[PDB]
Amino acid sequence: KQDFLRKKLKVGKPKEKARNATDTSFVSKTISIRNQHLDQNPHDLTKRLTLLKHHNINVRKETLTTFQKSIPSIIKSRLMTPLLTQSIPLICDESQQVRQGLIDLVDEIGSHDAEILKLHCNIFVLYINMAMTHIVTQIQADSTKFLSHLLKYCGDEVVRKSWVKLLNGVFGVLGWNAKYVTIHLNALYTLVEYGC
Amino acid sequence: EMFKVIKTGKSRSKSWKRMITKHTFVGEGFTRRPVKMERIIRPSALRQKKANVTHPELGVTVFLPILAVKKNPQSPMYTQLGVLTKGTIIEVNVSELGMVTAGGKVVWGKYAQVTNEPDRDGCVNAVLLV
Amino acid sequence: TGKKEKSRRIREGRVKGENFYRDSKRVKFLNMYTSGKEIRNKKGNLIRAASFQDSTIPDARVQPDRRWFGNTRVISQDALQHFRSALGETQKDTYQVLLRRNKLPMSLLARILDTESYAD
Amino acid sequence: RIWNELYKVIDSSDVVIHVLDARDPLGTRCKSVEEYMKKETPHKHLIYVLNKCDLVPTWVAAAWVKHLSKERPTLAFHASITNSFGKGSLIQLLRQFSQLHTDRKQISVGFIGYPNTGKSSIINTLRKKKVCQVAPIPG
Amino acid sequence: RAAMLPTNIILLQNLVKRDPESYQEEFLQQYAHYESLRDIFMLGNGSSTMAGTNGTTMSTSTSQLIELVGFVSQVCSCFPRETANFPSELKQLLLEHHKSLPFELKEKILSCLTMLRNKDVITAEELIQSLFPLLVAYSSHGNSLGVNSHAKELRKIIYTNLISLLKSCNTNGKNQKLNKSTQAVCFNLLDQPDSQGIWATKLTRELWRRGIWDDSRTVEIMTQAALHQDVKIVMSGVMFFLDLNFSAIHLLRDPQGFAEKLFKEHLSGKTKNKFDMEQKISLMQLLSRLIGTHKLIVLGIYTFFLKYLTPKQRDVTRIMSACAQACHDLVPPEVINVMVRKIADEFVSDGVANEVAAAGINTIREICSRAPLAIDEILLQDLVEYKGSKAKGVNMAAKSLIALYRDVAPEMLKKKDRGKNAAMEVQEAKK
RNA sequence: GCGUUGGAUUGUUCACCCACUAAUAGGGAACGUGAGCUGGUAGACCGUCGUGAGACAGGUUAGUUUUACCCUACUGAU
RNA sequence: GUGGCCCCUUUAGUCCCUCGGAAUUUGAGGCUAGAGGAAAGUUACCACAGGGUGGCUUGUG
RNA sequence: GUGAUUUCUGCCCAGUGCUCUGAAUGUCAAAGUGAAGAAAUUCAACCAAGCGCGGGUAAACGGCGGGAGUACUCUCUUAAGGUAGGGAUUAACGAGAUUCCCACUGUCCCUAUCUACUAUCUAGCGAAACCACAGCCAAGGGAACGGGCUUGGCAGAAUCAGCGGGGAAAGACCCUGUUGAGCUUGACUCUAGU
RNA sequence: GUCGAAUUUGGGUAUAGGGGCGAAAGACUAAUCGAACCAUCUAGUAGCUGGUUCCUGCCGAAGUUUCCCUCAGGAUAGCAG
Ligand SMILES: Nc1nc2c(ncn2[C@@H]2O[C@H](COP(=O)(O)OP(=O)(O)OP(=O)(O)O)[C@@H](O)[C@H]2O)c(=O)[nH]1
Numbered sequence A: 001k002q003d004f005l006r007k008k009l010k011v012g013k014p015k016e017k018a019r020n021a022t023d024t025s026f027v028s029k030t031i032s033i034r035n036q037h038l039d040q041n042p043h044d045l046t047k048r049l050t051l052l053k054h055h056n057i058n059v060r061k062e063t064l065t066t067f068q069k070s071i072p073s074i075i076k077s078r079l080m081t082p083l084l085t086q087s088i089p090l091i092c093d094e095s096q097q098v099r100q101g102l103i104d105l106v107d108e109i110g111s112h113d114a115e116i117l118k119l120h121c122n123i124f125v126l127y128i129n130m131a132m133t134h135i136v137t138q139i140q141a142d143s144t145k146f147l148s149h150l151l152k153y154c155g156d157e158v159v160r161k162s163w164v165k166l167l168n169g170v171f172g173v174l175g176w177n178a179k180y181v182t183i184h185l186n187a188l189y190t191l192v193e194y195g196c
Numbered sequence B: 001e002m003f004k005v006i007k008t009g010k011s012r013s014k015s016w017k018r019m020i021t022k023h024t025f026v027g028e029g030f031t032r033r034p035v036k037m038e039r040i041i042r043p044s045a046l047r048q049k050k051a052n053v054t055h056p057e058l059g060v061t062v063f064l065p066i067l068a069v070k071k072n073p074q075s076p077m078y079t080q081l082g083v084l085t086k087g088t089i090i091e092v093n094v095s096e097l098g099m100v101t102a103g104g105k106v107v108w109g110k111y112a113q114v115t116n117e118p119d120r121d122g123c124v125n126a127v128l129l130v
Numbered sequence C: 001t002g003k004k005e006k007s008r009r010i011r012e013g014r015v016k017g018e019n020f021y022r023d024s025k026r027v028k029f030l031n032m033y034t035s036g037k038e039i040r041n042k043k044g045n046l047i048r049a050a051s052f053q054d055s056t057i058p059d060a061r062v063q064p065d066r067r068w069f070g071n072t073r074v075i076s077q078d079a080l081q082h083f084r085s086a087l088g089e090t091q092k093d094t095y096q097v098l099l100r101r102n103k104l105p106m107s108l109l110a111r112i113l114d115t116e117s118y119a120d
Numbered sequence D: 001r002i003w004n005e006l007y008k009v010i011d012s013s014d015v016v017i018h019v020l021d022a023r024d025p026l027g028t029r030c031k032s033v034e035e036y037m038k039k040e041t042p043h044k045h046l047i048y049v050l051n052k053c054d055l056v057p058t059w060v061a062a063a064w065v066k067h068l069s070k071e072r073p074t075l076a077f078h079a080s081i082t083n084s085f086g087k088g089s090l091i092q093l094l095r096q097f098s099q100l101h102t103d104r105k106q107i108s109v110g111f112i113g114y115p116n117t118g119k120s121s122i123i124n125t126l127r128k129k130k131v132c133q134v135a136p137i138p139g
Numbered sequence E: 001r002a003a004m005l006p007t008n009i010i011l012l013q014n015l016v017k018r019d020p021e022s023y024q025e026e027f028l029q030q031y032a033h034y035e036s037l038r039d040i041f042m043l044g045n046g047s048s049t050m051a052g053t054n055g056t057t058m059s060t061s062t063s064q065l066i067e068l069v070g071f072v073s074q075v076c077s078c079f080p081r082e083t084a085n086f087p088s089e090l091k092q093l094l095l096e097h098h099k100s101l102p103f104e105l106k107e108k109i110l111s112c113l114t115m116l117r118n119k120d121v122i123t124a125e126e127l128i129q130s131l132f133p134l135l136v137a138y139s140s141h142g143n144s145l146g147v148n149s150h151a152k153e154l155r156k157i158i159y160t161n162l163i164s165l166l167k168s169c170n171t172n173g174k175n176q177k178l179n180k181s182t183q184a185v186c187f188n189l190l191d192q193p194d195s196q197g198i199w200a201t202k203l204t205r206e207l208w209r210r211g212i213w214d215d216s217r218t219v220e221i222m223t224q225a226a227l228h229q230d231v232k233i234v235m236s237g238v239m240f241f242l243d244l245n246f247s248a249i250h251l252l253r254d255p256q257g258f259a260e261k262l263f264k265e266h267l268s269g270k271t272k273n274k275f276d277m278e279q280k281i282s283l284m285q286l287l288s289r290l291i292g293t294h295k296l297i298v299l300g301i302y303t304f305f306l307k308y309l310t311p312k313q314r315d316v317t318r319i320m321s322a323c324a325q326a327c328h329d330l331v332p333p334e335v336i337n338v339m340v341r342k343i344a345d346e347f348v349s350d351g352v353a354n355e356v357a358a359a360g361i362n363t364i365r366e367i368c369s370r371a372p373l374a375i376d377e378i379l380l381q382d383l384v385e386y387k388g389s390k391a392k393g394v395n396m397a398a399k400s401l402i403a404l405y406r407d408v409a410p411e412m413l414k415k416k417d418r419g420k421n422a423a424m425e426v427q428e429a430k431k
Numbered sequence F: 001g002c003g004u005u006g007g008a009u010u011g012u013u014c015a016c017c018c019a020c021u022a023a024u025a026g027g028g029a030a031c032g033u034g035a036g037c038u039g040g041u042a043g044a045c046c047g048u049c050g051u052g053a054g055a056c057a058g059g060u061u062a063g064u065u066u067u068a069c070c071c072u073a074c075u076g077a078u
Numbered sequence G: 001g002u003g004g005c006c007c008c009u010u011u012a013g014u015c016c017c018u019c020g021g022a023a024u025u026u027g028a029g030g031c032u033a034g035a036g037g038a039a040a041g042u043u044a045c046c047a048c049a050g051g052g053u054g055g056c057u058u059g060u061g
Numbered sequence H: 001g002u003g004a005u006u007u008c009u010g011c012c013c014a015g016u017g018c019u020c021u022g023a024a025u026g027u028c029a030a031a032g033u034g035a036a037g038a039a040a041u042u043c044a045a046c047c048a049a050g051c052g053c054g055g056g057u058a059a060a061c062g063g064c065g066g067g068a069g070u071a072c073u074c075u076c077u078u079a080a081g082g083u084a085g086g087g088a089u090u091a092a093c094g095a096g097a098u099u100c101c102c103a104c105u106g107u108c109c110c111u112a113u114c115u116a117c118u119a120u121c122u123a124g125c126g127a128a129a130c131c132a133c134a135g136c137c138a139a140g141g142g143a144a145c146g147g148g149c150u151u152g153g154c155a156g157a158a159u160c161a162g163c164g165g166g167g168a169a170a171g172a173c174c175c176u177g178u179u180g181a182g183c184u185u186g187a188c189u190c191u192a193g194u
Numbered sequence I: 001g002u003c004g005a006a007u008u009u010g011g012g013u014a015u016a017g018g019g020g021c022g023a024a025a026g027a028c029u030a031a032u033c034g035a036a037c038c039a040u041c042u043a044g045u046a047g048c049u050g051g052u053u054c055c056u057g058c059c060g061a062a063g064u065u066u067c068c069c070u071c072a073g074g075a076u077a078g079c080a081g
């Protein structure tokens, strides 16, 4: 318990700094804030793109409605294929409201630009035949609406690629109740038509 | 005579808390501890930053900022608490005096010994150790 | 049998109150809230004073040393001025922040009455 | 009595948030405390939080945040247990300060400002339940 | 409960494990969903870019596949039909994409393969061909530099899973067919000179420590690693042969040539100057501890030490403690005399400090304990000068040298030091 | 010797504010342990802590001692 | 000149004692000589039994 | 467990618990098996569950970030993002806690008056608490404090109605038992049940 | 405060003490409840308090001196008969 002391001479190690040498070395980190996006920018829909994954349901519905309204000014741009990539998996969504909003969006984008549907037809049919085999019946029922609205616009390359997956998925979901059966039967009519 | 007992609770039955009655030096980045975790209380009024240091030569005194407490002769716990009792030895800045060693290195810290009991006087008066 | 402090200490590898919970270090901390207390006998008189209340007047000496009277804190002019410049740059910017701030030296940062005397 | 609590809170705090009303921040600023924190306590951080941003348009909030980010970080905020704004940004900033103060073992954040600015509501928003009493009356 | 049963897997599997003749349709209702899910997976904060993610939120498709994989892997043994291609689907899901799968799904498949191998559905000979190629791929430096690639965690998972596999296989009897096969891949990794033998060395050390790979074939792998060009592989080999050394030295094929090749390649030959001092010292330790133990002769060691035998040098107490460890009864004492006269000139000279002199004498007497006739009486006397030295380091040191030569060559000492029995033994034996 | 006020303020008052006034002086006899009348344990909630029972750095709320007819003193009365 | 300056573990017994109806052989106990060295908190929901001026000050660091 | 409706409901199975018809190996009781010995006995092997090990679960207790390159250090993502600038202007009920306004008044300045039953006096009836002895003051000693002691001021019967200063003259709080009980917990020893 | 109902109530009946019942206050369970009441074991017991009955004569004290895991109930030196 001394007021002054040495460790030791400590042969082999670096010598030491004596007792009073001042050390003028430091480091200064710089704080980083979020941006918070308070000022309108042209790149604003690119931020609403990812709200299709929002845990809330009204958020996703209103986002799909906004993208529906903003179609003609973005139909030819760098945002449409990511829009469809991020919105197609809502076929297996838990809400009739969101599925209906997506039906409306695909109708609008089909009336405007159908080459994008022709380009994205594969993941479309994959998610449709996933919904056809979904253990949830709310999702298993609303498959054929997406299918019919798809055939309405692209129609024949979908069957030129995948015919049997479609047919066996429909015959599965049919079980082979009031209006879902009618929708399945209309889809069957349109499918067999595009098979002619 | 140094620590006062402080009691906590509605029915005050727990004491466990100790207030230092005398003047103190805490440092530059003090930042009080939470109440559930603080035991030693060093109140803001009994907290000194500057002393009144006299050079025995030159017949001159200066109001210098304190840098540290190295040795309070009573129970070196008190050194870590930073208690400025009589006879306490402190490091004070001396850059105002323009002292320089052989080599041209400016001196900015020196030892001083307090000569008063600042629990009785708000002043902390000290003498430089040349 | 498995729920015994003996078996626990065996399978893993002293103070009153060491359990599956509350190791050595924790028991001492939690005893702080209680036993800042004053011990007495049955008739009433102090055996053991409360903590930080020992009540003994120590021998308060300070020995001579050649290490007093010496320069304890030294700095060269070039390092000093560079240190001034960098921190004058740093501490004007509020988004910046120094990391340690305690190991660092921050301390390094006519009159006519002589002629006329109120009376002339 | 109140200013004793103020200085107690500051001395116990490692960070000080300064809550302003977006209707009148310069009215609700309290510059003397910032000057005291400059001279006395440079080791504290002293950031701004605009609150009640839901009452004013977005461009006014952006303007004030731009005007005040020149000097102090200045987050914008809206306090509600249900529908909030700025919660994650403030969380991120506080854990930044925590990462800087890695040796202290804990970091205390005081809430300073005028009455009726939303300090209790900001705390209740961070915790996401009613922790502090709240009322439209000031005190 | 009925409508929720398809959503609750934990109850479904406990029901299926009881009566699996029932719950066939319940299993097909989920296998179809799993098929449709895998058929899919087969194929910033700036004002402009899309917002990023935190790293812990996932997709509802992935959250379903992660559950279905476990269900199917736990009831495949009850439904051998309709599941025969399931592990092959997992394998070609892993080792043909590597990147379009999230980390949680990869981890889940990696654990389901391990339990499918614990059960005898899958064999080690085809699980190894799944696990090893992913190590090299996630140690790529191009796969590990995405945004949220979990490359380090995956490289740890695959490594500990391989360890569990081989520990599993070597319990009853040592599966030589497996060990001899997965040592060949270590050999064929150490050939690739970039860094890929890391996953051979780090693994062989673990298996040696677990006692699973006590064999002559394995020590050759670490020999080749020590003889390698990459620093972190050479160090793995050296630290293996260190851990005072371990029993692996008693399974070497030629320790003398090993030490010769080491001293020639790394330290002296090209003087490439790749190793830092902290690694050079660990190489010196290995060389000296092999040499002293097995009676080797190199003779270049003893001039290589002399550059570093100076008290103004970085951490010399380790170097001089290995100097003694390379001394024998069977080497020419002149090449050690030069060493002792360097130490004596530079450590027990005029003006030197107490610790310095004590270190010198202590590292000389433990040399002379192995090579007694390596310093002569004239300097022995100069060093036993320091007996009564008042410092308590040099005295304790000199007494050790005196007690060392009191039992070995007491005639070199003077009459003052021969302690009551050496002198009596000399008086009878001098006539 | 004689007087030395009326009020506002409990997000509080170990005090201050504006008026009137000739003036708006300071104190004691209680507070040198504890003594008229009035504001400022049991139940419950939030916060900190605790594995927990519970405790508190806190905060809020509600919440039953009841003389004199005895001696003395004092005030009046035979 | 007969040196120096200040209490629970274990082993062994020639021809040691005993195992009580006699003996032998294993074990056990002695007496010898050796070598080693049971247990945490809380209670304001509580209860019981006890206990508890040196004439001091004033305006001037 | 939460506590109408409405609105919101993001992430973590590192930890502690719970759970899994979860391989082998490890730990591993009794019975049973083998070896030695003349035998009592000694040793070894085998050895269920449980543990350990690794999978699931957070409207379970906890808890609050992720990844990569060489615990540290650099880097960049942070999806508890307000869906919109219409984002919060938000019932009824209550012997619940609180502030302000109108009205109204003896709450107050500033007290006065009246009625009934008492008190009061009388006939009859007739207790209780408390009680070492008793009962005028001042100063001193004194445990800060005398009705009794010392020194002084004084002191005249027996008494009625009132008063509440004192005496009546009958509290909390603090501490201690190696106490009594209640409660809790991987504190110790046990135990029903399984 | 409430007053047509989760309403108020009589009689009969069921639940019994480490047990019951509880729209939960540790509330109620015959003026008794953080474990009812009666008798016995039982003159239960610590610790501490209170008290302990006739006269005279003669002698006549004591307070760290040394220790058992610190208080502690003690064991002892010395003093007196
Ligand atoms: N619209 C809106 N109102 C807010 C916001 N924050 C607070 N308020 C409202 O402001 C009122 C008063 O502010 P407080 O929450 O009490 O803020 P405070 O005065 O600092 O709180 P205290 O510390 O308790 O005094 C509250 O009753 C809220 O209703 C906000 O972000 N937006």
Ligand SMILES: [Mg+2]
Binding pocket: D115, D116, D117, D137, D138, D139
């Ligand atoms: Mg307020």
